[PDB]
Amino acid sequence: SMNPPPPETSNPNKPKRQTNQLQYLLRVVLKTLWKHQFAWPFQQPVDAVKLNLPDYYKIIKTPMDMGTIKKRLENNYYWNAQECIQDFNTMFTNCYIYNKPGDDIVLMAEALEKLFLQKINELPTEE
Ligand SMILES: COc1cc(Nc2nccc(Nc3ccc4c(C)n[nH]c4c3)n2)cc(OC)c1OC
Ligand SMILES: [Cl-]
């Protein structure tokens, strides 16, 4: 297949915590972006086979998507909020690497990223 194995959503050896910040990332940030009208391309790994993107995984070596992030949050996969924020950042910046200006996906990513940043600016202080 053109598609690599998807990023893991669990691993017994991953060190894991629950924090109020991670809870906010699931209950507010992910939830808000998941229900957005532009979420749909980002709700699962890029399927380069079905979508006829034979160079996608030639260019993008650290893929990420919100389906993966959602499952990671549900599985308490993260050690801290920063690890989760980094996955969102990877998701957005992969688009800015792969796509060109004006592409549908890049305009959608930009809108979701603006909203992400607005929600992350209200991340609670860790208790
Ligand atoms: C095709 O490019 C990406 C698709 C996706 N993801 C995705 N998931 C399900 C359906 C779907 N259809 C779909 C979207 C857009 C288009 C354009 C334009 N032409 N045909 C298209 C079909 N797409 C994610 C991506 O990056 C995160 C992409 O950009 C590399
Ligand atoms: Cl992915």
Side-chain angles (χ1 to χ4, degrees):
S1 176
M2 292 175 189
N3 294 328
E8 68 184 15
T9 57
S10 62
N11 190 314
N13 280 338
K14 174 75 177 54
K16 297 184 266 290
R17 289 172 63 246
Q18 294 182 59
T19 74
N20 65 317
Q21 298 185 320
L22 283 157
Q23 293 171 328
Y24 178 89
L25 278 159
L26 179 54
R27 298 183 184 184
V28 175
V29 181
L30 186 284
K31 180 169 176 175
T32 292
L33 267 67
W34 190 263
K35 299 180 161 180
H36 193 276
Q37 61 175 302
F38 289 166
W40 57 273
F42 306 98
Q43 287 174 329
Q44 58 285 315
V46 173
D47 185 344
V49 174
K50 190 51 174 180
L51 300 168
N52 193 23
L53 302 168
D55 67 346
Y56 185 79
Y57 292 110
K58 301 187 193 302
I59 293 167
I60 297 304
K61 303 305 191 183
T62 309
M64 188 48 59
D65 66 278
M66 292 202 296
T68 297
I69 294 167
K70 181 173 183 289
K71 287 182 182 185
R72 288 178 172 197
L73 286 163
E74 290 166 350
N75 291 332
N76 303 306
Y77 176 88
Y78 296 113
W79 181 256
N80 61 26
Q82 184 45 234
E83 288 189 340
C84 177
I85 292 169
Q86 173 200 305
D87 284 345
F88 278 101
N89 179 82
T90 295
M91 180 180 77
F92 297 127
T93 56
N94 286 342
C95 298
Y96 306 147
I97 292 167
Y98 182 78
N99 290 100
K100 64 185 184 300
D103 279 352
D104 292 356
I105 291 291
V106 86
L107 295 176
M108 295 169 80
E110 284 182 322
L112 292 170
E113 183 180 42
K114 181 177 179 169
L115 182 54
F116 173 77
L117 292 170
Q118 284 163 352
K119 296 304 181 183
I120 215 69
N121 284 342
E122 308 301 331
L123 187 72
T125 300
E126 185 177 1
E127 61 185 11

